Structure formats: structure tokens, C-alpha cells
Amino acid sequence: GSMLELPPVASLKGKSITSAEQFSRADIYALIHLASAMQRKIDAGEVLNLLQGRIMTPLFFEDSSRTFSSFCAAMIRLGGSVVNFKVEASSINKGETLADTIRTLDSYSDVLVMRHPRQDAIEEALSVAQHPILNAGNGAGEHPTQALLDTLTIHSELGSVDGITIALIGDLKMGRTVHSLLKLLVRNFSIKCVFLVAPDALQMPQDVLEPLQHEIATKGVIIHRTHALTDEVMQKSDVLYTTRLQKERFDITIDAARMRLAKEKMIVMHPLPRNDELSTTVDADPRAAYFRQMRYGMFMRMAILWSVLA
Amino acid sequence: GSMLELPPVASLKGKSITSAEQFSRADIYALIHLASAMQRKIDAGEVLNLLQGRIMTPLFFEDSSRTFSSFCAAMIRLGGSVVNFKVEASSINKGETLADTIRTLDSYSDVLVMRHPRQDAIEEALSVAQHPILNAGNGAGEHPTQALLDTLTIHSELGSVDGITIALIGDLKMGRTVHSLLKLLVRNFSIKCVFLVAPDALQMPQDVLEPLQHEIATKGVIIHRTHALTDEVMQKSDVLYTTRLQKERFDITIDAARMRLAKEKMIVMHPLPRNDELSTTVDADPRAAYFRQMRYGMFMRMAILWSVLA
Amino acid sequence: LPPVASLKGKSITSAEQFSRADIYALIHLASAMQRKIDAGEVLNLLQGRIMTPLFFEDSSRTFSSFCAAMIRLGGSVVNFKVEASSINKGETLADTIRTLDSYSDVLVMRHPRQDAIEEALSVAQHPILNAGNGAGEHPTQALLDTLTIHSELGSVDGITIALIGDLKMGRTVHSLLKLLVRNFSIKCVFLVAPDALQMPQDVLEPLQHEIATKGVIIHRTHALTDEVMQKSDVLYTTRLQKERFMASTSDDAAALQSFAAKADITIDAARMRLAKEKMIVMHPLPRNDELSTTVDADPRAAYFRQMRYGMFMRMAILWSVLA
Numbered sequence: 015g016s017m018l019e020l021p022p023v024a025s026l027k028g029k030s031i032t033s034a035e036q037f038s039r040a041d042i043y044a045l046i047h048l049a050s051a052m053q054r055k056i057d058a059g060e061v062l063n064l065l066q067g068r069i070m071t072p073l074f075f076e077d078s079s080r081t082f083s084s085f086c087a088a089m090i091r092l093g094g095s096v097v098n099f100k101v102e103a104s105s106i107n108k109g110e111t112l113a114d115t116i117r118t119l120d121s122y123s124d125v126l127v128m129r130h131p132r133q134d135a136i137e138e139a140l141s142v143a144q145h146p147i148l149n150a151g152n153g154a155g156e157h158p159t160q161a162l163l164d165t166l167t168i169h170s171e172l173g174s175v176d177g178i179t180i181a182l183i184g185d186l187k188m189g190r191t192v193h194s195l196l197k198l199l200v201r202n203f204s205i206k207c208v209f210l211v212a213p214d215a216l217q218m219p220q221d222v223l224e225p226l227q228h229e230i231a232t233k234g235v236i237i238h239r240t241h242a243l244t245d246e247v248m249q250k251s252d253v254l255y256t257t258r259l260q261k262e263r264f265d266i267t268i269d270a271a272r273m274r275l276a277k278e279k280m281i282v283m284h285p286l287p288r289n290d291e292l293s294t295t296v297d298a299d300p301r302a303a304y305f306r307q308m309r310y311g312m313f314m315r316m317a318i319l320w321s322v323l324a
Numbered sequence: 325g326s327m328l329e330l331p332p333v334a335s336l337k338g339k340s341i342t343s344a345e346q347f348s349r350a351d352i353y354a355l356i357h358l359a360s361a362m363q364r365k366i367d368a369g370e371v372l373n374l375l376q377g378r379i380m381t382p383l384f385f386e387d388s389s390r391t392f393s394s395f396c397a398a399m400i401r402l403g404g405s406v407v408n409f410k411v412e413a414s415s416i417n418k419g420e421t422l423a424d425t426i427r428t429l430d431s432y433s434d435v436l437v438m439r440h441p442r443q444d445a446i447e448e449a450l451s452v453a454q455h456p457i458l459n460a461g462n463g464a465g466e467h468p469t470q471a472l473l474d475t476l477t478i479h480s481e482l483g484s485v486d487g488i489t490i491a492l493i494g495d496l497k498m499g500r501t502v503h504s505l506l507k508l509l510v511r512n513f514s515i516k517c518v519f520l521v522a523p524d525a526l527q528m529p530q531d532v533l534e535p536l537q538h539e540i541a542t543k544g545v546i547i548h549r550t551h552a553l554t555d556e557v558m559q560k561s562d563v564l565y566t567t568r569l570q571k572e573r574f575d576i577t578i579d580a581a582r583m584r585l586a587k588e589k590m591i592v593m594h595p596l597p598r599n600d601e602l603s604t605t606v607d608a609d610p611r612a613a614y615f616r617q618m619r620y621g622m623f624m625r626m627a628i629l630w631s632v633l634a
Numbered sequence: 635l636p637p638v639a640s641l642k643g644k645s646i647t648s649a650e651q652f653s654r655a656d657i658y659a660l661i662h663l664a665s666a667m668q669r670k671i672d673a674g675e676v677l678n679l680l681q682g683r684i685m686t687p688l689f690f691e692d693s694s695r696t697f698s699s700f701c702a703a704m705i706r707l708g709g710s711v712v713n714f715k716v717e718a719s720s721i722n723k724g725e726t727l728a729d730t731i732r733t734l735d736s737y738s739d740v741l742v743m744r745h746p747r748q749d750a751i752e753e754a755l756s757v758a759q760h761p762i763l764n765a766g767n768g769a770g771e772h773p774t775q776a777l778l779d780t781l782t783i784h785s786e787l788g789s790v791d792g793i794t795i796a797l798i799g800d801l802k803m804g805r806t807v808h809s810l811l812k813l814l815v816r817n818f819s820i821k822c823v824f825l826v827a828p829d830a831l832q833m834p835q836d837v838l839e840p841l842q843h844e845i846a847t848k849g850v851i852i853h854r855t856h857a858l859t860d861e862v863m864q865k866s867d868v869l870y871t872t873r874l875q876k877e878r879f880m881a882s883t884s885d886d887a888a889a890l891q892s893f894a895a896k897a898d899i900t901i902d903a904a905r906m907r908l909a910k911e912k913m914i915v916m917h918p919l920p921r922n923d924e925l926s927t928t929v930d931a932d933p934r935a936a937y938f939r940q941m942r943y944g945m946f947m948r949m950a951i952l953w954s955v956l957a
């Protein structure tokens with residue numbers, strides 16, 4: 015992969031990432047191609063030195079395994095460095111405010127990666143930070159880089175995004191992942207059909223669906239609400255994207271039996287982590303893409319960091 | 325051409341840093357000049373490779389945001405590395421002593437950065453370590469690199485340290501920052517006047533004032549106590565250095581209204597974190613330098629690290 | 635700095651997986667790495683490679699020396715912390731392994747459960763290095779301990795070694811006894827512990843063939859007798875593993891008390907007056923009161939230098955695994 019170019023995505027340069035609404039179809043494709051080239055070079059064992067002497071600081075005010083780790087790994091694999099700031103042993107225990115904490119890490123860093131239980135926390139950070147801030151999850155609001163890596167996953171597994179039927183399953187109300195993903199998909203691609211599969215209490219919120227109505231209508235995107243993985247859903251979906259019940263903010267299980275109803279050419283996705291909604295019996299199935307999904311996330315996050323800091 | 329552009333301060337080579345007392349006026353000017361050269365290169369986007377293959381290990385037995393992070397960032401910006409040792413998950417929980425803990429990190433590292441709630445813990449660490457130890461705060465004692473970066477901030481903001489009138493405000497008793505700062509300023513500069521602004525119970529300790537007796541007399545420094553931030557203090561001070569009540573170790577509030585009495589040209593400083601003593605209404609004021617102070621912190625710690633390890 | 639080829643791309647689980655030739659090639663590579671680092675040389679061997687530590691229980695030396703080792707090879711570290719991870723959202727151990735496996739070149743794993751490493755092995759593609767699995771094994775400890783003996787005394791064959799303290803729960807002495815006996819011609823091993831904390835059968839029995847055919851003497855005592863002090867070339871002593879005895883049961887109370895009450899195993903300056911001239915005192919660390927600070931000034935106290943040999947052995951290991 016040594017002869018592949020790594021052109022940064024210019025429209026991302028020096029900008030904070032807060033929403034899936036920020037990106038055009040052309041940004042996304044260009045991030046996909048960049049991530050793909052990142053993957054090729056890293057897998058061939060090539061050493062990248064694009065971000066030498068640039069610092070990423072993670073500001074994680076809630077738990078994370080994948081998002082924290084992929085961002086760190088992505089930064090390192092670009093030749094960058096990470097300052098390992100941790101909230102629990104910080105000067106917040108001395109009474110420091112969220113705003114002063116952002117200002118503090120912003121003094122040392124080239125980019126901040128921020129996750130916070132309050133939906134409004136990243137606007138607050140944005141209002142005081144000089145350097146780009148990447149939204150790693152703002153309460154039940156959004157998770158725009160998950161959306162990007164999820165789309166990368168779809169494109170690499172199935173070969174296209176236009177024309178798919180996708181089921182978003184589980185806690186759609188509190189799932190910031192499915193908020194960002196639906197936005198990113200409906201705004202930039204010709205989705206055929208979206209199954210919104212959730213108990214009534216946990217349906218996709220109105221504040222996500224409504225701003226999309228113009229695009230849903232002009233592109234003819236079919237939106238179908240269910241409360242179960244019916245036979246129809248199992249048989250038409252090219253992607254089953256399922257989610258964890260977001261317990262910390264307070265049928266639909268996929269197992270191998272349920273999987274014998276699925277199409278030959280489809281993928282099962284989950285942003286992770288999972289509880290019982292997604293059975294380990296599915297893990298050996300080639301259509302299980304939720305592990306590969308995590309590796310795609312590192313390479314997308316490399317495409318993003320390089321584009322922001324180039 | 326490092327030895328022209330970033331000459332290390334030779335006097336610091338291979339030595340621990342424990343007190344503001346160990347530095348001459350010439351050391352401080354050499355560090356300031358090296359620090360602002362660090363700043364010039366980093367701000368222009370130049371990558372430093374001075375300390376590749378060298379390791380800094382933080383040993384923080386109390387909370388920190390600024391001191392930990394700026395040391396980690398400074399190390400990284402010099403091309404060096406950090407081993408992220410955390411006290412809370414260490415073999416101290418198996419009953420290891422402080423001395424054994426120090427020998428352990430001393431075995432792997434080139435330099436240790438230590439913050440500890442006990443005043444004598446730095447001297448206990450020195451009696452066993454082979455490599456330099458940088459005192460990042462020892463109980464209510466001293467914070468010597470804070471005094472260095474505070475002095476860089478004064479010099480860079482105002483142009484001069486000789487001849488200033490400075491107010492040290494808040495919890496002067498337990499304020500390890502004002503202990504070191506007063507030492508550093510009075511031993512090496514001809515300060516016109518110091519205001520110590522605190523009720524008697526939180527006044528500057530006698531063990532700080534007494535040993536400065538010779539310098540106070542020889543340079544004719546004026547020193548007054550007040551119990552409040554009076555109009556006279558407001559109108560005469562070039563530097564308002566304010567501090568947090570160190571609650572964990574047991575009117576003077578600056579706000580926009582009080583700032584209406586300040587000189588047109590002066591700075592408000594605070595080593596941070598702040599509580600109610602320094603109102604956010606001050607933040608927009610050009611004289612508010614307590615955010616820029618954090619960034620000088622990084623560059624001073626670059627100058628220090630490079631000098632210790634060159 | 636030639637990598638030891640047998641280690642390439644392989645997980646490290648047990649002291650049993652190494653040959654004599656493996657051990658000497660690691661020793662020589664470790665000592666070659668020490669030469670260069672001490673001379674101030676910078677190594678770029680693993681630039682762009684990532685090590686992720688997965689520690690589910692406490693560590694100072696193993697965690698820090700793996701990180702430092704990785705760094706001094708030019709490699710990098712992703713500082714994954716269990717306490718603030720998605721484990722709190724209910725993620726299983728398996729799914730945790732697969733997660734960090736997606737980003738890393740090698741995982742260094744310590745877990746209070748003996749079978750956890752094997753479970754990690756069954757899901758991960760990249761090599762896993764056992765940094766301690768319960769009271770089970772600590773394979774890189776045994777390797778660095780052997781480097782220490784070799785560097786300090788000059789030779790491993792022919793030694794008399796006392797293994798002292800909590801031998802029941804001591805994963806270090808488990809790995810070390812296997813490594814030594816499988817691959818060296820040991821003259822004598824003193825198993826010095828109270829009965830309640832003696833070396834387990836599941837360690838000794840698989841070694842019995844080698845013990846017998848090599849004619850290795852095994853002597854059990856519950857004290858540091860004159861005989862042990864005068865004969866031993868190495869006194870390898872251990873901490874009582876209190877955390878393996880947190881049940882509040884009578885079985886646990888008896889085991890915990892026996893360390894001091896049913897044995898006489900403290901090493902202090904007075905005791906060291908009985909030791910030979912050419913020998914070393916070792917301890918994987920951390921220590922409590924079983925190894926007195928009055929021994930620290932003795933040239934025969936090797937337990938601090940042992941930590942430094944540890945960093946160099948771990949460099950030789952990481953480089954050999956990842957080359």
C-alpha cells in the first residue's frame with residue numbers, strides 16, 4: 015500500500031466535530047477512501063509519521079472502551095501523542111468547573127476528544143476552546159464519529175450504501191449512535207428503507223425524524239416502525255444494526271435461530287458493548303460484522319484526526 | 325541547531341528540583357529565555373526531537389490537572405515519553421512503602437515528577453532515587469516549578485519583574501504556590517512592594533518571611549499585610565495573584581466591579597483551580613492572564629525538562 | 635540485536651513453553667539491550683507498534699516495566715483502564731479482549747482468575763503476555779529472575795536456591811521452579827514455607843520426572859536454618875499473598891497466620907551474617923516485613939537491580955514477540 019496517497023479531507027481542517035449533520039456525501043466518501051488507505055498501509059506494517067509532536071487529550075466524563083481506545087490508537091498510529099488526563103484524579107475534586115477544565119486541557123493540546131453525560135456539555139466546551147473538539151458522545155444526543163465508522167463498515171462489507179434497507183434496533187430513544195447514523199444516512203445517501211425496531215417507549219425521537227422529513231420525502235426513503243424483528247424485517251434488511259438498552263439514562267433479540275431467517279448477503283452490526291440483545295451464538299456467523307466494525311473505527315478515526323490536524 | 329536555538333540551562337543538569345531557593349537570578353532568566361524560545365518553535369509548528377528515548381514518570385499522590393498535564397505535554401513536545409503510573413492501581417495496595425515505590429519507578433525512568441500530601445515525602449524520595457525528582461507540590465510546602473512559570477508569566481506579560489508591586493491574595497498559609505513564588509521573587513529580583521492579602525489565620529507563614537529577612541533589608545522591599553483587597557491594593561498592584569482556599573489541608577473576591585479600580589496595565593493571576601474568589605466576569609478582561617499562565621506553564625516545563633536531561 | 639526467532643508472534647502463558655536455548659538467547663539479547671540503553675543509545679525497533687496493558691488487579695513493576703520496555707524499543711502504549719471502561723456497561727471479559735485486540739499489536743494481561751488468560755487466548759488474534767493469572771503463573775518474572783541470577787552469579791547450572799515464603803499462592807515461584815528445573819541442572823532447592831503455604835502438588839508432580847532424572851535435591855523446611863543460609867547461592871523470598879486469602883474463613887486465617895507463626899523466614903542483617911560471600915537475595919516485590927530494610931545496603935541484595943533486569947528482559951521479549 016506504499017504508493018497510496020493520504021490526502022487529508024480539506025473541509026475538516028481545524029474544525030470541531032459535533033454532529034453527523036456537518037458532513038456532505040463527498041466528505042464521507044473521501045473519509046471512507048482515506049480510512050481504506052490508512053488500513054492498507056497499517057496492515058502492510060507501514061509506519062506513519064504524519065502527526066509527530068501533535069497531542070490528543072481524551073476528556074471522558076463517562077465510561078468507554080472502544081471510543082477512547084480507538085482514538086488513542088488512531089492518534090498513535092498517525093505518529094501523534096496522547097496526554098492521559100483522567101477526571102477522577104483531577105482538579106475537579108478541588109471544585110474546578112467543566113469550562114475551566116476544557117480551558118486547561120486546551121492549553122496543551124492540538125485536539126480534544128470529549129464524552130459527557132450532558133447533551134449541552136460540548137456546546138459549552140466549544141464556547142471556550144481554541145482547538146478542535148471531537149464529540150465522542152454527548153448524553154443521549156449524538157455520536158458523529160460512530161456514524162462515520164458505521165457507514166465505513168457498511169460500505170466495506172456490502173460494497174455500497176445507496177439502495178440498502180437497514181433496521182435500527184433496540185433503544186432508539188437514548189441511542190446517540192442511531193441518532194447520528196440515521197442523520198448521516200438519510201442526509202447523504204439514497205437509502206431504500208429504514209426499519210425502526212423498538213418498543214413504543216424507546217422509539218426514535220421526533221427531534222431526529224422531523225428535520226429529516228424533506229429528505230425522506232424527496233429521496234423516497236421508506237420509514238417503517240415496528241416493535242419486533244418480524245419476518246419481513248429479517249428478510250428485507252441488508253443490515254441489522256442493534257443496540258444496548260441505555261440503562262444508565264434511567265421482541266428484538268438476535269441469536270442464531272433468529273439468524274436463519276436472514277438474507278445470505280447482509281451484516282449484523284452493534285456499536286457495542288452488548289448485553290443479551292445480541293447472542294454469542296451469532297459470533298461465528300460470517301455476517302457478524304460487529305467485531306470487524308471496531309477495527310474499521312480505528313481507521314476511520316485515523317482519517318478524521320489527520321484531516322482535522324493536517 | 326539546538327545548541328544555538330534551545331541551549332539548555334547547564335546548572336540544572338541532572339539535578340532534582342525541590343525549592344524555589346535552589347535557583348539564582350541568572351538561572352531564572354536563562355529558563356525564561358529558553359521557555360519563550362520553546363514557545364516560538366512550538367507555535368510555529370516545529371517538531372522537537374531532543375528527548376527521544378527518555379522517560380518521565382509522574383508520581384501523583386494528590387489530585388492535579390495543570391501540573392500533571394503540562395508535565396506530560398512538555399515531555400512529549402520535547403520528543404520524550406511518559407510511563408502512566410497511577411497510585412490507586414499500584415502495588416502500594418499490597419503494602420509497599422513510599423521508598424520502595426520510588427526505587428521502582430527510578431528503575432525505569434530518566435526523571436520523576438512527584439506530588440505528595442506530606443511535606444517531607446520529597447526528601448524521603450531523594451534519599452533513595454538515582455534520577456532527578458521534580459517537586460510538583462509537597463503538602464503545604466512548596467511548588468517550585470509553579471513559581472518559575474508564574475515568573476515567566478509576569479516577565480512575558482509586563483516586560484519586567486524588578487520594580488513591580490505584587491499582591492498575593494487568599495490562602496497564604498496553605499498556599500504552596502505563594503510560598504515558592506514569594507521566595508523566588510524576593511531572593512532574585514528587586515520587587516518594589518508586596519501586599520499579603522489574607523486574614524491573620526490564613527496569613528503568609530513566618531517560616532517563609534523570616535528567612536527572606538536579609539533580602540528584604542538589602543533590596544528595601546516594602547511589605548504590608550491587609551485583611552481585605554482594599555482600594556490601595558487595587559490601585560497600586562501590577563500583579564494581583566490570587567489563590568484558592570486549600571480546604572483539603574485543614575472580602576477578597578476579584579470580579580469585574582472590583583476590577584474597575586485596577587491599573588490600565590496590570591495582570592490578574594491564579595495558579596488554579598479557582599473557586600468563588602475569582603469571578604468568571606473577569607475572564608473577558610485583557611488583564612486576565614490566568615489562562616495564558618497555564619500555557620507558559622507548559623513552555624517553562626519544557627525548558628526545565630530539557631535542562632535537567634540534556 | 636537479533637530477535638529470538640522462536641518467540642515471534644506467540645503468546646506467553648507459562649514458563650513451560652521455553653527451552654534452555656530460548657532462555658539463553660533472551661538473556662543475551664536482554665544484556666545486549668542493557669549495554670545500548672545504558673550507553674544512551676535510542677532504539678527505533680517497534681515504532682508504530684502498540685502494547686495495551688489489561689490489568690484487572692494491582693501492579694507497579696510489571697505494568698511499569700512493560701510500558702517502559704515498550705517505549706525504549708520505540709513502541710507505544712494505549713493506556714486502557716478497567717475502572718472507567720465499558721465493563722461498567724456490562725461488557726464480558728471476552729468482548730473486552732476482542733476490543734483491545736482490534737487496536738493493539740500485543741496485550742499484556744494480569745487477572746485475578748487463573749483461567750482468564752486461556753479465555754483471552756481463545757478470542758484474541760494478537761499475542762497475549764501473561765503478566766500474572768491468579769495464583770497460577772508469572773512467566774516473564776521467571777525469565778527476568780533467571781537473567782538476574784545469571785548476571786549476578788555468572789551461572790545458573792549447579793546453584794542451590796531457597797524458595798521462601800508463600801509458596802502456595804506465589805505465582806512467581808511457580809514459574810521460576812518450572813523454568814529452573816526444566817532447563818537447568820539445579821543442585822538443590824530449599825522449599826522454605828510453613829506447611830499451610832507449601833509449594834503445591836500441581837507444581838511439583840509435573841516436575842517429578844525431571845527432579846528425579848536430573849538428581850535435583852528437594853528439601854522442605856519451615857525455617858531459614860543454618861544449613862539453608864550457608865548452602866544457598868540464592869535466597870528468593872516472597873510476600874504473603876493476603877489478597878488470595880480474603881474469604882474471612884478459618885482455612886484462610888490459618889494460612890495467613892502460618893506465615894509468621896508456623897515459620898521462621900525473616901531475612902534481616904543479623905540473618906545475613908550466616909549467608910555465604912557469593913550469593914544473592916532476591917524478591918519479585920513488593921515486600922512487607924519478611925525482607926528487612928537492614929539488608930538493603932548489602933552488595934548481595936539484588937532485589938532492586940532485579941527490577942532493572944526486568945525492564946531489559948521485557949524489551950528482549952517484546953522485540954522477539956513483535957520483530
Ligand SMILES: O=C(O)C[C@H](NC(=O)CP(=O)(O)O)C(=O)O
Pocket residue numbers: 077078079080081082151157160190191257258285286287720723
Ligand atoms: O453505550 C452504548 O451502548 C453505545 C455507544 N458505545 C460506544 O461508543 C463504545 P464505548 O462505550 O466502548 O466507547 C455509546 O453511545 O457510548
Ligand SMILES: O=C(O)C[C@H](NC(=O)CP(=O)(O)O)C(=O)O
Pocket residue numbers: 105108387388389390391392461467470500501567568595596597
Ligand atoms: O491547588 C491549588 O489551588 C493551587 C495549586 N494548583 C496547581 O498546582 C494546579 P493543579 O492542581 O491543577 O496541578 C496547588 O498547589 O495544587
Ligand SMILES: O=C(O)C[C@H](NC(=O)CP(=O)(O)O)C(=O)O
Pocket residue numbers: 415418692693694695696697766772775805806872873874918919920
Ligand atoms: O505480588 C507479589 O508479591 C509478587 C508479584 N509481584 C509483581 O509482579 C510486582 P507487581 O505487582 O509490582 O507488578 C505478583 O505476583 O504480582
